[PDB]
Amino acid sequence: GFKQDIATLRGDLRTYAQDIFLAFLNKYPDEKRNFKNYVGKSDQELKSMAKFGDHTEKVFNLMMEVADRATDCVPLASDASTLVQMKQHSGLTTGNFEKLFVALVEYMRASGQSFDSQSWDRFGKNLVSALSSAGMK
Numbered sequence: 001g002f003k004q005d006i007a008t009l010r011g012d013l014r015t016y017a018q019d020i021f022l023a024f025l026n027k028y029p030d031e032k033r034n035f036k037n038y039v040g041k042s043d044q045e046l047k048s049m050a051k052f053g054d055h056t057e058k059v060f061n062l063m064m065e066v067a068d069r070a071t072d073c074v075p076l077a078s079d080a081s082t083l084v085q086m087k088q089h090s091g092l093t094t095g096n097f098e099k100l101f102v103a104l105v106e107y108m109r110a111s112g113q114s115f116d117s118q119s120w121d122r123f124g125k126n127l128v129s130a131l132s133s134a135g136m137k
Ligand code: HEM
Pocket: 031, 034, 035, 054, 055, 056, 058, 059, 060, 062, 063, 066, 088, 089, 092, 096, 097, 100
């Protein structure tokens, strides 16, 4: 289930974080508008860029804590407001997060690992509602 998936992802976090982020970046090319440094680079070149690995792992470190602190895939309001008020998130809209989670759920279903794919879909939707309620446009 959802709780076990957090453990599965944490068990190989840097790999999963990179592959999910790449799936997101390649499903939605226009999203590199927020990642100017990742343009014109194949997946293997991205994985050799120090900040690509370091930043993506830190994102997914934090995502797993927001998931872990959730109840029934509903994140805490204190976690949602942290994501909105984050300085690095200044220009983001909730579409950014909705698209991230479509990619992540698509990746899980294609994985052959036994993820609770529907729970992550719910979690992504619930995170998006909590981002709007916390002020994100
Ligand atoms: C649950 C979802 C997310 C979590 C937990 C999260 C968390 C984080 C964290 C921890 C950082 C800092 C990384 C570092 O400084 O090393 C960060 C930076 C950043 N995030 Fe998010 N994030 C999420 C979703 C998104 C989405 C959907 C976007 C855009 C589509 C986004 C755009 C950015 C940008 C532009 C930065 C700063 C630039 C960079 O670090 O390369 N984030 N986020």
